[PDB]
């Protein structure tokens, strides 16, 4: 699967509290984390469906 799917979730420098989904390689499933609101990385999805399609493998 894509390499960005194996990188840990990135909150970013902004201080908002936005719930996003990221692929947890170690768990083989998408979970939620707190996104700060800016400079998102690729392992950041607005829904579990998009997260699994892209990183499900």
């Amino acid at each position: 699967r894509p390499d960005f799917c194996l990188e840990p979730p990135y909150t970013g420098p902004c201080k908002a509290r936005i719930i996003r989904y990221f692929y947890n390689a170690k768990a083989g499933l998408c979970q939620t984390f707190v996104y700060g609101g800016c400079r998102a990385k690729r392992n950041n999805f607005k829904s579990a469906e998009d997260c699994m399609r892209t990183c499900g493998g």
């Binding site: 909150t11 420098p13 902004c14 201080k15 908002a16 509290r17 936005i18 719930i19 707190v34 700060g36 609101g37 800016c38 400079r39």
Partner: protein, 216 residues
């Protein structure tokens, strides 16, 4: 955590919570119909909640109002966060009282060393948090964030870390001597040494704010 203390109930009447299903950013009431917040807090649909203390319980003093217009600074940069300021016009005027009040815009830019009050639910946010911190000299801000600080930003906090605003506080107020001098924007981590919080310098946008409110 944050390193702050729970604010006294309704002691920060100009503080608001931006909600789109859950609390995601803060803001400040500048007049009975307008709220100022951070541009990175933009969402097409936003409900503003005033008179809050514990955002997870219906206390009876709150006012819930939807945003009618959301206006970001035309020069906001999503990458550098320069000009990270946004205005929100409420669908209808709110009722001002002891728990819901406005905060004054700056008369001028507060000098470094000025003690201020930072508030937000940034902590599972629950009770409104408060923090007393001073505006730091621009040189120290620049030294902490090499080549990342513009003249529209100011650092507030401590170079040793320990106390700082964090996720959930964005858009919130930094008030010094009764005037809104800053808006919670960004920082590398929270409360880390040599990395104090960076805030939007409101005194550089007073005319833009006043002109925008007048034309809308």
């Amino acid at each position: 955590d944050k390193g702050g203390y729970t604010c006294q109930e309704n002691s920060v009447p100009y503080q608001v919570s931006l909600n789109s299903g859950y609390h995601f950013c803060g803001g400040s009431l500048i007049n009975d119909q307008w709220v100022v917040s951070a541009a990175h807090c933009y969402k097409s649909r936003i409900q503003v909640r005033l008179g809050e203390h514990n955002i997870n319980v219906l206390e009876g003093n709150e006012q819930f109002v939807n945003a009618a217009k959301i206006i970001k600074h035309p020069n906001f940069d999503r990458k550098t966060l320069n000009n990270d300021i946004m205005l929100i016009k409420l669908s209808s005027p709110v009722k001002l009282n002891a728990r819901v009040a406005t905060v004054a815009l700056p008369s001028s830019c507060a000098p470094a060393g000025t003690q201020c009050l930072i508030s937000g639910w940034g902590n599972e946010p629950d009770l409104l948090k408060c923090l007393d911190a001073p505006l730091l000299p621009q040189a120290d801000c620049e030294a902490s964030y090499p080549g990342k600080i513009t003249d529209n930003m100011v650092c507030v906090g401590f170079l040793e870390g320990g106390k700082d605003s964090c996720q959930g506080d964005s858009g919130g107020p930094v008030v010094c001597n009764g005037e809104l001098q800053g808006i919670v924007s960004w920082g590398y981590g929270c409360a880390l040494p040599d990395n104090p919080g960076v805030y939007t310098k409101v005194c550089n946008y007073v005319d833009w704010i006043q002109d925008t409110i007048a034309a809308n």
